Design an enzyme around this catalytic site. Structure first.
Site, PDB file in Angstrom:
ATOM      1  N   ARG A  93       1.101  -1.072  -0.181  1.00  0.00           N
ATOM      2  CA  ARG A  93      -0.031  -0.377  -0.254  1.00  0.00           C
ATOM      3  C   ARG A  93       0.937   1.423  -0.092  1.00  0.00           C
ATOM      4  NH1 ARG A  93      -4.847   0.255  -1.820  1.00  0.00           N
ATOM      5  NH2 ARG A  93      -6.014   2.430  -1.173  1.00  0.00           N
ATOM      6  N   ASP A 146     -20.638   6.816  -3.999  1.00  0.00           N
ATOM      7  CA  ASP A 146     -21.316   5.422  -2.389  1.00  0.00           C
ATOM      8  C   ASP A 146     -22.915   5.929  -1.603  1.00  0.00           C
ATOM      9  OD1 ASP A 146     -18.200   4.333  -2.876  1.00  0.00           O
ATOM     10  OD2 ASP A 146     -17.706   5.746  -0.959  1.00  0.00           O
ATOM     11  N   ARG A 191     -25.365   5.853  -4.829  1.00  0.00           N
ATOM     12  CA  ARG A 191     -25.460   4.351  -5.454  1.00  0.00           C
ATOM     13  C   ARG A 191     -26.456   4.010  -3.864  1.00  0.00           C
ATOM     14  NH1 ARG A 191     -19.243   3.542  -6.542  1.00  0.00           N
ATOM     15  NH2 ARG A 191     -19.776   3.082  -8.977  1.00  0.00           N
ATOM     16  N   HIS A 214     -13.022   6.264   1.945  1.00  0.00           N
ATOM     17  CA  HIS A 214     -14.257   5.674   0.965  1.00  0.00           C
ATOM     18  C   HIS A 214     -13.099   4.295   0.330  1.00  0.00           C
ATOM     19  CE1 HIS A 214     -14.879   4.660  -3.763  1.00  0.00           C
ATOM     20  NE2 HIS A 214     -14.445   5.223  -4.509  1.00  0.00           N
TER      21      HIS A 214
END
Lengths: 332, 332, 332, 331
Positions: free
Chosen positions: D105, D165, D168, D192
């Site tokens: 990451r 988000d 949705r 997110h």
């Protein structure tokens, strides 16, 4: 060989039938604001206007027609005869009688009954599957009147009711908070007028309940006096009328929004006036405002708002008042 | 803490300065029609209204505000003071004198000059980079006056001129041909009024010349009498005033279309009133309607339309008439 | 009782009856640009997507559906089965094969015929009163194909033809002149592709003929080489394919413009492919682009453009080319 | 005299500075969806496209230009050089790296930092008074990155965050209730991705709380399993990718919606990523999604949602995790 014919080869005829026709009855300031707002939102392929004053009706039609270049609604028609309203999907009623100086509310409604006994049957004759949207004051009572005369089922007879009230409430809510009305939420329900109900429990921004933050919200002991916002809602049309001599723009936009959900079958929820015998302990054929789902078949469903005992009793009192008038009407 | 402060946390406070502001002067029917059309086309982030009648002004402000939920123009303001017009991009002038009985044309223009000596310097003080769009009649003369008083270069001073006339012509051309006005092309140029020029040679559909197809077009010997279409254009406002008492809708849409081109810098060609000393043997400071290219700096260019000598003499004669009145006006 | 039933009181059954449904066949880049453009112009109450590849198809549908908050189209469906396209007012066909290495042109077309034989009958079963809009290449041939397979009268079968060609032409005319394409007029007619015809005589701005100003316009002797603009138009798709791999945005906007005229019955004039046996001495069942009045019954009228002998011969040559291919196509 | 000479009479030209210019950086499907939705919503008088691949860039510009007839956005430009973006009011960043098989990451974000070290200074050079909108994944961290590199105040650095988000969520909510999503309300907040937080308390239709009406809403003991609507929100983009190869349309409309509020100063409330050192026990420089008032100066205000202990803690955990990565970055 005419110019048209030298220029254009025809290969089809007409059918008559238009697909997305709206009719506005009454071409006073309210009706014409309804009309221009509907035209600029491209909600219809045909727009019919109807009223009893011939010159005025023709001049308004002409004036709209002269703007056709800037619009996307290719057929604007008018006439006293209701034949011009044929096959409309939605018929918006703004026509009514003006109350006289020494005249009772009941008499004013009776005079509107008599007027609607001409209007409503001519509407159903020429557009038997249309939705009725009643804007005429007093709207709650006149929706009932349209319902009884039309013989339409309740889902296709809608009153504008508390729709603009709720918009005004949200405008004001936004002005206090510094947020656009789109993002402020709040509902004014019941009788369109002085006895309307501002639902304090449902008021929120971003899902944050104002009542939870401020328990005294909408009470006498409220330091910030939010009850005034509702008073302003109720006295807003009167304040505008005093100032400019009538209202139009907000109601026009308000109506066009209702037409949008109906015509496009959007199933948005709006506070509109519906027959609510059954709910909140009301047992008479009466129309009050409740959040309703609006689509191509009119009001398909409605939302059951939890109301406190006080609020419930406001709706009940309003229904008794409405029935108190309705029961003295003469339809035959 | 207050309900606002508990709800919303403020990050910054910067002096609020608008980016797409439009002012409309005069809240008569014409002014309000312009305003509502602009609002519904989302051409501005701030709309300002000014006029000398305060009650009426405020009424119109509030009625619009009350419909904010249904719009995307976040801020509407009004006032008799021009400070509310600060930093406007486009300022539309609809206000003017109404002609009294037995009053000369000249004296009507003079009274409009006294009025503009108040309005125009106030507009330029508070937004000196704006474009002026003059709508008030007599529009061609009042564009000059606006131009002379402002000190603005000609590109930033525009008159609605024959914009709506042209649109009316196209409407009527449309009803004869059976074709939407968008696809019917024709230009009315010159002086807005009785002396305007219907430019037969340019009339077309899909690029096919109606003149070429039908040589007698717009002549006395035309068995279809297309000259009457022009007559209808010139007498449209009168016939509408007679029927309904004023005009509003078409002109409002006409003006929002011009505003669109300007605010979005589209460089569309519109027939508006502009300074044309130099063209068609015109030698005075006169404003007439020619196709102009409109953008964010107003009129950037104009199209040199080819005229017959007869058409050319009509512009000339109109130019002389306009100068005849203009030269008898007092500014100091 | 569920949360739905606790929240909402259902007033009636329905719907399953969409009033302004549009189906898009093919979910390549073209079909989806057509889909998104239609969604953002609010032209439909229901959109249906069809394609043979299920995963791609489901994915596209979902991605659009997740945007529903920002749209005003409440039902979006898709599926391999054409039952999802029932009662569509307009059906837009974008599916089609691509040419393979060493594959002949005849063979390519035949393969497109072969997929149309699956697609068209399934479209007509489920929406027998729809308008058909063919976009698939080669568009003129495949519009014939859809016409012969469907059984539809010529008015209800429309090819996108030189619609976008004409738009590209006006774009370049606009760049050259310094004017928005909306105010530049020019028509590209005939066979979409190499043999299409730029009608020089019809080109104008503000009704002033460029041909009359510049009589060498579009000849070989033209010092300004306007013929190159037409070359650019014809090769523009190829140049975009080299650069980015495919085309989408322009064609998508162009197809949504036609949809608009159909759905809203505008009767605007578009240069679209239509059956022109009878015109320009063509006696074969052939489709090519000419200006057509577009509305709710498809093409109701067409403009007889006056063509020079050379221009007419080119259309006749294309017709002969087209027919010679079509007659070698197998429909059984 | 040329044709133009005979047709058009030209007037002294004054300085044209663009008033409503928007730049989109990155012409992948996401960038291009952002562009087309912006164009069809008339938010701009000039649209700029930038990316590192010249052919693809030019072709995407051309394709939009060829549609100018049907638009009201008169200038569309592109280029590799950021001079084409001068005087943008809003700059939308969609470019960024793709995580490689086996890559941590920290390493992925480090690569994004190096790319942003080229893009951000260039963008601020040419439009110093712009609002930055960051769409690039991982959005919350990359908004931080854009902030620290730009030198901009927090109000002008915006992450698309949980905007889509929430959109949705409302769609899925609407599908269950038979109501349009415009009339369904609920917010998804915080980081997110997988750790985002659906505020059950705020879910309502017409001001009536779903929680109050159905107290087991959101929990394991829910017969209707409303938790699956949020799991569905978390997994949507992933699912769309398996099906069609990528996402574009929904996010494009999502970004155009925020552009709308910004360009027109609407002061609507959107769940976007902002720097919230100060709320929720968060004592670090981290950006999370919170309902924010968007206008012409970007994020002017934010709404203070009352979260549950659980909801707060998840935000606090995301904050810690984001800072743990951000503290190892070198600029």
């Amino acid at each position: 060989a005419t110019l048209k014919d030298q220029l254009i080869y025809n290969l089809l005829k007409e059918e008559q039938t238009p697909q997305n026709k709206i009719t506005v009855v009454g071409v006073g300031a309210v009706g014409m604001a309804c009309a221009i707002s509907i035209l600029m939102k491209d909600l219809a392929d045909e727009l019919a206007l109807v009223d009893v004053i011939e010159d005025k009706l023709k001049g308004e039609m002409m004036d709209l027609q002269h703007g056709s270049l800037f619009l996307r609604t290719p057929k604007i028609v008018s006439g006293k005869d209701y034949n011009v309203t044929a096959n409309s999907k939605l018929v918006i009623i703004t026509a009514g009688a003006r109350q006289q100086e020494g005249e009772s509310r009941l008499n004013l409604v009776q005079r509107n009954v008599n007027i609607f006994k001409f209007i409503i049957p001519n509407v159903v004759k020429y557009s038997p599957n249309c939705k009725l949207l009643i804007v005429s004051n007093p709207v709650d009572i006149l929706t009932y009147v349209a319902w009884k005369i039309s013989g339409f089922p309740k889902n296709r007879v809608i009153g504008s009711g508390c729709n603009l009230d709720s918009a005004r409430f949200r405008y004001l809510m936004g002005e206090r908070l510094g947020v656009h009305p789109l993002s402020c939420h709040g509902w004014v329900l019941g009788e369109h007028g002085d006895s309307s109900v501002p639902v304090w429990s449902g008021m929120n921004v971003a899902g944050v309940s104002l009542k939870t933050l401020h328990p005294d919200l909408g009470t006498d002991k409220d330091k910030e006096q939010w009850k005034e916002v509702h008073k302003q809602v109720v006295e807003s049309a009167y304040e505008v009328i005093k100032l400019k001599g009538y209202t139009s723009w907000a109601i026009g936009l308000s109506v066009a929004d209702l037409a949008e959900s109906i015509m496009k079958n959007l199933r948005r929820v709006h506070p509109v006036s519906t027959m609510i015998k059954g709910l909140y302990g009301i047992k008479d054929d009466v129309f009050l405002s409740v959040p309703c789902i609006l689509g191509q078949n009119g009001i398909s469903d409605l939302v059951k708002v939890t109301l406190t005992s006080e609020e419930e009793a406001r709706l009940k009192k309003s229904a008794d008042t409405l029935w108190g008038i309705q029961k003295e009407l003469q339809f035959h």
